[PDB]
Curated annotation (Swiss-Prot), chain A:
Full protein name: RNA polymerase-binding transcription factor CarD
Record keyword DNA repair present: no
Free-text function comment from the UniProt entry: Controls rRNA transcription by binding to the RNA polymerase (RNAP). Required for replication and persistence during infection of mice.
Organism: Mycobacterium tuberculosis (strain CDC 1551 / Oshkosh)
SUPFAM superfamilies: CarD-like
Pfam family, one: CarD_C
GO BP term (any one): rRNA transcription
UniProtKB/Swiss-Prot annotation, chain C:
Physiological role: DNA-dependent RNA polymerase catalyzes the transcription of DNA into RNA using the four ribonucleoside triphosphates as substrates.
Protein name per its UniProtKB record: DNA-directed RNA polymerase subunit beta
Full protein stretch here: 104 to 152 of 1177
The species this protein was found in: Mycobacterium tuberculosis (strain ATCC 25177 / H37Ra)
Highest taxon above the source species: Bacteria
Family, as annotated: Belongs to the RNA polymerase beta chain family.
Subunit and interaction comment: The RNAP catalytic core consists of 2 alpha, 1 beta, 1 beta' and 1 omega subunit. When a sigma factor is associated with the core the holoenzyme is formed, which can initiate transcription.
Length: 159, 49, 49
């Protein structure tokens, strides 16, 4: 499926350019690896081509995905558990899934709650992580000028 | 020791070397060797000899 | 988690400047750390200060 030069999305790290395809040997068989150059912390990720779907690597979403995530990002009736730990584990396991809709849900919930009160060290760190990978995936989805994409996200969040 | 200790807590496939590594004990070990050790001494500067 | 290949940058400031400005004559050390997840097969390699 994957080709050299494709821009795929890794689950917990956001965008990833597939820059080469290695052919390393483990247990005497040439399981080909693909190397991904993510840029969040400048790490090179190597995965087999077989377990790409098992680890859940995923192509970027289309314009139906864009209107779907904007539709879910502008939606009310988002009642949350009042317990701080329950809420934290809930949106952490939403963030770790790798779905654009779930990441947009986490950034809209924490954005409205930060606009309300301003939460915490851990939740501001989580909102920064989630919003930066959502901005990176959006800029990958439309080739649309990083930090101007941030202004786009701020505008569609503030509405 | 801290690598193992925070390797067991954090969720796998979400961790990376810069999340496992805490370099503060290495920094402190080299610092407390070069200052306050018996074999790291003030240099004797009376003359070149 | 395994380490490899230490490297040094150039020193931050020369010896007379370090003596004059009350600093330490040092160079930054960079190693290459590498994380393996055995059940899936994953190599997450960084460059750690």
């Amino acid at each position: 499926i994957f080709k050299v030069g494709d821009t795929v999305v890794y689950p917990h790290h956001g965008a990833a350019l597939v820059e080469a395809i290695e052919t390393r040997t483990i247990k005497g068989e040439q399981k080909e690896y693909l190397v991904l150059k993510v840029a969040q912390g400048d790490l090179t990720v190597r995965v087999p081509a077989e377990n790409a779907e098992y680890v859940g690597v995923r192509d970027v979403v289309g314009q139906e995905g864009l209107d779907k995530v904007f539709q879910v990002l502008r939606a009310p009736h988002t009642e949350e558990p009042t317990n701080w730990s329950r809420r934290y584990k809930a949106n952490l396991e939403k963030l770790a899934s790798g779905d654009v809709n779930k990441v947009a849900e986490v950034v809209r919930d924490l954005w409205r709650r930060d606009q309300e009160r301003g939460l915490s060290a851990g939740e501001k760190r989580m909102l920064a992580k989630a919003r930066q990978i959502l901005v990176g995936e959006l800029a990958l989805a439309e080739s649309t000028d990083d930090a101007k994409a941030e202004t786009i996200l701020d505008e569609v969040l503030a509405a | 020791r801290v690598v193992r200790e925070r390797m067991t807590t954090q969720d796998v496939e979400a961790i990376t070397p810069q999340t496992l590594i805490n370099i503060r004990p290495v920094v402190a070990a080299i610092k407390e060797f070069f200052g306050t050790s018996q074999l790291s001494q003030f240099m004797d500067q009376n003359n070149p000899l | 988690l395994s380490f490899s290949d230490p490297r040094f940058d150039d020193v931050k400031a020369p010896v007379d400047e370090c003596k004059d400005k009350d600093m330490t004559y040092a160079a930054p050390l960079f190693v290459t750390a590498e994380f393996i997840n055995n059940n899936t097969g994953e190599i997450k390699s960084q460059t750690v200060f």
